[PDB]
Design a protein around this ligand. Structure first.
Ligand SMILES: [K+]
Ligand SMILES: [K+]
Ligand SMILES: [K+]
Ligand SMILES: [K+]
Ligand SMILES: [K+]
Ligand SMILES: [K+]
Lengths: 292, 292, 292, 292
């Protein structure tokens, strides 16, 4: 459901830029075989910015179909207009997804009162569980712990993906919310630290290409075996870093292609193909993790 | 017209959040009478974030119809997907707009090369003049002078709205582009300084309520009369700051309502109504500028 | 020695700005009675910036004398010139202090190679244990984990006071150093989190006025009792924050006076007396902690 | 003289780190011949951080003796303890210096009120003109325009060396001070922009090796001939940047050695010798400026 290693899955494309079903099926089978806890479909790593809402919905529904009940699917449903976020969420009502990952409005820089009204309105128009998502480097907006506390009082707001990389947020949030509100890292390089402080898992880029290792790390964390988890983390740290050598998901798509998990590493503009220097860097990180 | 005081006009709304034609007419007449150089329709201040593409186009067309040839209109046309920006651009071909204001992709944080490809593609598919728009605090990415220099070689990329507030950008860009490339400030509080360093004008929030003083300030600046311009700037500085006391365009829409230029101060979520403390701050700034 | 709750003790002054022996003795007796693990004398909170090296040495020696073997004393010995740091350290050779707290050079912004040469030269001119101290908001310099690793190879460099508040540093450093290199927080508000990640204690401002609570928190942490430690932390969090409402040690000196621990709250310029608003804020925090 | 191109002169050292009188003479003659306005002796670039007060005074006196009335000398006199700044100031009373350059307290992060008291006290105890010096990247504190305005009312506080590189400060300060208060840039790369906005000159690192071009650039700027000045600035921009490729004054001392102006490029720890890559970068910048 909402703990352990959750992959922010790539939306694999053909050379034309449209979803590649055979690739998507190969990835999903991989995540089932690897012990991934859930799949986030059409999150940031899934190129939500460059799919239209129809295309987005098609990918989510295809992912659900291919998952075939073997692995839970959380849909990306964020938007920077509240009405649009409500419309997008309503597309998934009764779909089979287990909840929604909803990013703070980007670009328009709402106030904290605005963020409260936005997420409350979205939560009120669905029965689906809502995971807030804070990623200020992308959005220009920072959903602060006090406001997460206020929102956690809404019945179906049940967790947060905290992608600041600021580990002080874990216990600031935890003290204002109930014991069952889920804290998930959105920052691979700090995620083991985030779990060590009390978080419950990660929505991960790295899990796209090191799914088994990520699942093993997160299990060890949950069991309180941090030193064993950290050995895995150290083997993965160059991926955690170098999968952002160029803008995500440029590196992870390349890595997926290199590993034979997807047919092509195509992305949509303004994301551009990986540079030669980038390929060499990512290749080295994959080798360090023992994947190549 | 791409120099002088250009207003980033509000999109006035009724209580339902729908565009108020009567209020828009009043603003347009105000700008014609007050000597504003041009109107930026559905820029940031015009709530491009929360209008859909149809409503956005309607507002641009309504603005053109109401302007009736008396003042030039520039349309906001940016998007974070290069295909969507191209699509939106096509809607305005032969509309009567003089140019497009096209923001760097927000949220997805493309590389410089990605920005280059993005804007180059948009420019290729129109004959309309394009004004690049850099606002890193909103978008998460920063279109750097070197890339602006590469883009300025494209025939119909004709200027930039630089909203960093980092004044060193003026001459870094100027030295890389031709003498006819327009530099426009997107930061009211530093705009006179921007013009003093070589900028050609401003795309302004303050101009929505102080159009005549903005128009004269920019003229004096273009003539080299900076001391004279600075007297006006000092009277407007509280507005340049306090129009951002809560997220733009919340304060300026309230100010327009207080002056009687628009029927209601309604905005779309996630923007919310001005706080009482914000009304007090904004009113004080209006009085400092001599407007109430 | 170098774990648990270490107080960065204030240098109490008379009204003239010189050390007050009776106050210093009262504080030291308090730390012995409270279970404080060690005292840092003439660190940042002890006003190292505004004591001359003679005055500094006198305070350290007086603190040692008053401690009377009951509680270990670590001297502040940092300087931004290597020669000066060596001279200051040599004053304490054979003094009775148990080690030195040596801040990265401030103002001059050395490179990482510079930081390496600086601390290596200092370590080579003493037999005393050296605790590095990184506080970039004050110094303009950031001693990065790689360089801490390089330095940890020097026999008598035995730990670090990490005052960035960036909790990712704990495990970055730990993986590059031996199991016996000591990690101490220099940031009260994050210090329980820092210990939860693997750190060994804190050099604390808050311990000046909540010494018993800080010692109890740190003991619980070391025992792996984080939830119990966090209850104490929550009671102390307003002090952890509000003891920096005005520049440290302005608030903590006031609080020490209010509690009857020191005779006067005098400081040296450019530190100035606490403002009325500050007194009210600090008073509230003391009340929250159950100290007043 | 407190306008035009003022050099923040290196303190040339022999291999032992002691001041080289022969090298200093050569530099002083160079500045007299090249039209430099004044010499700042034992500023940041002069390694004020690593000279003791006696050595600092010796260098100022030697500079005065060598200048022999041919060029005005301003002494660096700042400290982070108000008493120490006063003490140092007294050493220079009736020395022959024309003024003092006094940096905001570093490391201890005083309040604005603390800065006000600090500088007010220093000014009270001398008849020498005082130039305030703001460099937040080094000091950890930021002397804001409002406080500069309060200090400019003190009769002998006569200007400011503003080294933020934040160009909005020019007119924020100008509007709060009298027409005769001097604004000087402390950031070579933005200094021409600073002058274009109303600044009166620069306290420069670049001037150590490009004194004549700096002197002419500043004259053209003072005359309003900004286009002409900017041609010179463009030839000097690689030096303005690459003199900071490693910590200042490491690169400029190497540059002075390469040109033959000083016998050795030796500095005091924690400054270290220039890297090979830095020598290559600096040399390239020298050639761009036409100096080798
Ligand atoms: K809930
Ligand atoms: K939108
Ligand atoms: K062009
Ligand atoms: K060691
Ligand atoms: K020093
Ligand atoms: K004055």
């Amino acid at each position: 459901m909402f703990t352990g290693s959750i992959v922010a899955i790539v939306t694999p494309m053909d050379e034309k830029g449209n979803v590649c079903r055979a690739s998507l099926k190969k990835l999903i089978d991989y995540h089932v075989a690897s012990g991934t806890s859930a799949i986030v479909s059409v999150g940031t790593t899934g190129e939500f910015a460059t799919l239209n809402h129809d295309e987005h919905a098609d990918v989510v529904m295809m992912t659900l179909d291919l998952a075939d009940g073997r692995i839970p699917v959380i849909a990306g449903t964020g938007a920077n207009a509240t009405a649009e976020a409500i419309s997008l969420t309503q597309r998934f009502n009764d779909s089979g997804i287990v909840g929604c990952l909803t990013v703070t409005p980007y670009y328009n820089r709402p106030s904290q009162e605005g963020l409260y009204q936005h997420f409350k309105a979205i939560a009120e128009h669905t029965d689906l569980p809502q995971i807030l998502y804070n990623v200020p480097s992308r959005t220009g907006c920072d959903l602060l712990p006090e406001t997460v506390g206020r929102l956690a009082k809404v019945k179906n707001i049940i967790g947060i993906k905290e992608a600041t990389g600021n580990l002080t947020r874990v216990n600031q949030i935890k003290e204002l919310v109930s014991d069952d509100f889920v804290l998930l890292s959105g920052d691979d390089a700090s995620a083991l630290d985030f779990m060590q402080l009390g978080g419950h898992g990660v929505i991960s880029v790295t899990a796209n290409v090191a799914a088994r290792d990520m699942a093993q790390m997160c299990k060890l964390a949950a069991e309180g075996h941090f030193a064993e988890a950290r050995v895995i983390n150290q083997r993965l740290m160059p991926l955690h870093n170098k999968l952002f050598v160029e803008p995500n998901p440029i590196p992870v798509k390349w890595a997926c292609k290199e590993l034979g998990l997807v047919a092509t590493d195509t992305l949509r503009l303004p994301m551009t193909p990986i540079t030669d220097s980038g390929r060499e860097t990512v290749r080295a990180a994959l080798k360090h993790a023992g994947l190549l």
